[PDB]
Amino acid sequence: SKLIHVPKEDNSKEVTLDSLLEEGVLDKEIHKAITRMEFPGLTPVQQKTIKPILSSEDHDVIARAKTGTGKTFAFLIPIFQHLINTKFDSQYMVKAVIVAPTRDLALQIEAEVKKIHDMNYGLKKYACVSLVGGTDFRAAMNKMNKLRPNIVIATPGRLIDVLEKYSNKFFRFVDYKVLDEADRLLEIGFRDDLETISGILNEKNSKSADNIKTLLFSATLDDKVQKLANNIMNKKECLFLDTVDKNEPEAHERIDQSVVISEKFANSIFAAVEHIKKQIKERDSNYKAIIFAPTVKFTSFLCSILKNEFKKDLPILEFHGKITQNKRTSLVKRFKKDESGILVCTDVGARGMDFPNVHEVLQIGVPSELANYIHRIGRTARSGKEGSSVLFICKDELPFVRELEDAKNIVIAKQEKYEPSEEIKSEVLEAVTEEPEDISDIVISLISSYRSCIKEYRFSERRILPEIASTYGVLLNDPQLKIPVSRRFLDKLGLSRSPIGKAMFEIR
RNA sequence: AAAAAAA
Ligand SMILES: Nc1ncnc2c1ncn2[C@@H]1O[C@H](COP(=O)(O)OP(=O)(O)O)[C@@H](O)[C@H]1O
Ligand code: BEF
Ligand SMILES: [Mg+2]
Ligand SMILES: [Mg+2]
């Protein structure tokens, strides 16, 4: 398909809700909804995205815009507009399907649709239903039958379940499908699912197999995604709406980035505790921050430490895929409202999630993928607000930082070293309740995690893996100790032959 | 054992 580029214009023409109203692009009902939100004016992506989406319905849309710049409304406003000027057709059928890589992001997008509804009750006739895992399947279908939504927000897994069973009933008249965080949804582990989704929607469409128009949105994507999505893009042409220069870094420039480099991985923990401590003092507990960790078990562990240290000063929230979905939703809306607190989470919260006025984004270790560094720090400095970010890593993780410059052109100017005092180590380690068996599982989970991204971040396996494993000895206050495992376990890991295995483990 | 995703 023909991929048409539309680079970031220098000055360009101003676009406004009023202008789109007078121009005939937008109806008064949707115009009334967004105006009441009292935004200063449409964001760059929104100005560059709305009219093209409503344009000649023989083209697809790819849109790149930095984090926190209102990409959600950039495709929700047009969708609503499409629904208005087709209100006398199909009516009780899904006309827009929005897909997100995490449940909480899908539920967030739903909430944003509900905000549009609350600003104009006239738009409530265009109902919306979310379809995500961890929710009652029957209840969602009853909601489907009752509301007969024109908009569906979903995660790939639950959506396929519904489509396999009810495609004929609701999805024979889809006109739009949206891939939010598109690049992620087009990666291995999601790509096959979205191809399954796209195929079913096309096969079931009443007009034609190429009727559906596809919208791709993310803060991180290139031309590679257009190739990765070639099977889900129906139209013959495709617009690339980019509000970012080719050479410009995808990371938000307003974020004050820094990296704290330590000798070991374990004392990135100590550095972060000292940083948070310093931050709570200076800000007088007026501190809202998100700290990312590489692993669920380590996240839960890091959470346990931060409670013992800072629960007296701030709420500490634990957020990952092993948290029950009810609790995930509960803490997400709390941290959205709260003025302060520390959200401790995995990369489940790396993309899309919009928490107003986060002061800082902290990172212990590396993200699950290179791009997610951009999305991680993107949780702060949103909607014009300021923000800072700190990356806590060890010496053996520097290749990730270098790769960050080589690939994404992200240069972290502020760099500093760190060595923990004996007092801090005693303070933190004295406040661990975990048995040696628990510490083992935690470090093992980190070994598995770091082993899987050796190639991505150009890590030296002979160096990084022993360092991660050595965390076990540090936490038990005995650097000489190795992780106790069985011969079968060491074999299951496949390092029975590798010298690195012996350096990490002790066969008991 | 390892981040998401019908779990
Ligand atoms: N036109 C606008 N002007 C000011 N703020 C906006 C505008 N559009 C959206 N926002 C704000 O941006 C926040 C998050 O936007 P979001 O859709 O998450 O952007 P992205 O998806 O690109 O990260 C929302 O809380 C919203 O209040
Ligand atoms: F890119 Be945004 F944060 F969804
Ligand atoms: Mg978004
Ligand atoms: Mg924020």
Residue numbers in the entry: 88 to 595
What text appears in the publication on this structure?
(D) Model for RNA duplex binding and unwinding by Mss116. of short duplexes bound to D2 by excluding one RNA strand and bending the other. hydrolysis leads to core re-opening and enzyme turnover in DEAD-box proteins and perhaps other SF1 and SF2 helicases. ‘clamp’ ssRNA and form a highly stable closed-state complex.
A10-RNA + NDP-BeFx, N = A, C, G, or U. However, each base interacts differently in the ATP-binding pocket. H-bonding interactions between the Q-motif and adenine base. the adenine base that further stabilize the closed-state complex. significantly more stable and long-lived with ssRNA than with ssDNA. Ic in D1 with 2′-OH groups of ssRNA in the closed state.
